């Protein structure tokens, strides 16, 4: 099945600094990816569904980008709430694979 | 559940009710009558107050009368 990994390593940018993670699919899943934000000891929160369109109840700073295999997420400004481990899942296949994840720290 | 909300015998009010392509048209005129027993013979033209895109077919109508 499709395998999802996140290329960037842990980034310790400070509050108010723009950050960008990259998620790469093994094979083309079209626009079927879901970006998540999981705080430790907390349920994951889906940042962007598919591509471009932000999920409801998610702050405007989070953005959805990338078509085909390549997918990307950009945060305009950092905050204490924002720091977390982010994960991306392919939705094109029937079995679902989740991204390795990138840690975000102050 | 209401698509449209409106916040605003000696009287005769005339209404034409039609449904066409899912649009309900009401033509309303307001002309005073003189004879209590029945409206005196006259010619009037009804001007449409508003058009509502209800889409629901209308097969029947009923009136509402206040009772003391």
């Amino acid at each position: 099945d499709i395998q999802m990994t996140q290329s960037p390593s842990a980034l310790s940018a400070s509050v108010g600094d723009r950050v960008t993670i990259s998620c790469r699919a093994s094979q083309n899943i079209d626009g079927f990816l879901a970006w998540y934000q999981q705080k430790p000891g907390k349920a994951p929160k889906l940042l962007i569904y598919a591509a471009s369109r932000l999920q409801s109840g998610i702050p405007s700073r989070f953005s959805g980008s990338g078509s085909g295999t390549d997918f990307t997420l950009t945060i305009s400004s950092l905050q204490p709430e924002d720091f977390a481990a982010y994960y991306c899942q392919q939705v094109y296949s029937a079995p679902l694979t989740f991204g390795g994840g990138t840690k975000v720290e102050f | 559940n209401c698509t449209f909300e409106y916040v605003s015998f000696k009287n005769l009010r005339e209404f034409v009710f039609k449904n066409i392509d899912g649009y309900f048209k009401i033509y309303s005129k307001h002309t005073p009558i003189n004879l209590v027993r029945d409206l005196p013979q006259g010619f009037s033209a009804l001007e449409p107050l508003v058009d509502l895109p209800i889409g629901i077919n209308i097969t029947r109508f009923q009136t509402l009368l206040a009772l003391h």
Binding site: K42, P44, L96, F98, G100 | -
Partner: protein, 115 residues
């Protein structure tokens, strides 16, 4: 609001049978399909299984295939992830998520499972 809660996760002996419960409230459980996910400690997430809205059709992950069973009751508004032949690798925090990967997606708080 959509509310998801998880239960039935606890320490289990290897090879033991442990069954989870996915609480559903604030939405029509029957209409929506349900997915199961698990999070291994210091690892990425791993989707476990999916059950359909009616429960007729179900798929399973390659790692847990023929070992983990998923069931649901429409009247009880709960999805049960039965786990058998449990292993030390299987140890994870299990998250039950409805309509994964879409706008409808919601995530449960989760219950820790240890083996």
């Amino acid at each position: 609001e959509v509310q998801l809660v998880e239960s039935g996760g606890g320490l289990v002996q290897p090879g033991g049978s442990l069954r989870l419960s996915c609480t559903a409230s604030g939405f029509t459980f029957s209409n929506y399909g349900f997915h199961w996910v698990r999070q291994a400690p210091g690892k990425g997430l791993e989707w476990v299984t999916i059950i359909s809205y009616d429960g007729i059709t179900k798929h399973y992950a390659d790692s847990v295939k023929d070992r983990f069973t998923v069931s649901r009751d429409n009247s009880k508004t709960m999805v049960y992830l039965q786990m058998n032949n449990l292993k030390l690798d299987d140890t994870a925090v299990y998250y039950c998520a409805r309509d994964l990967g879409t706008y409808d997606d919601s995530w449960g708080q989760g219950v820790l499972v240890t083996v």
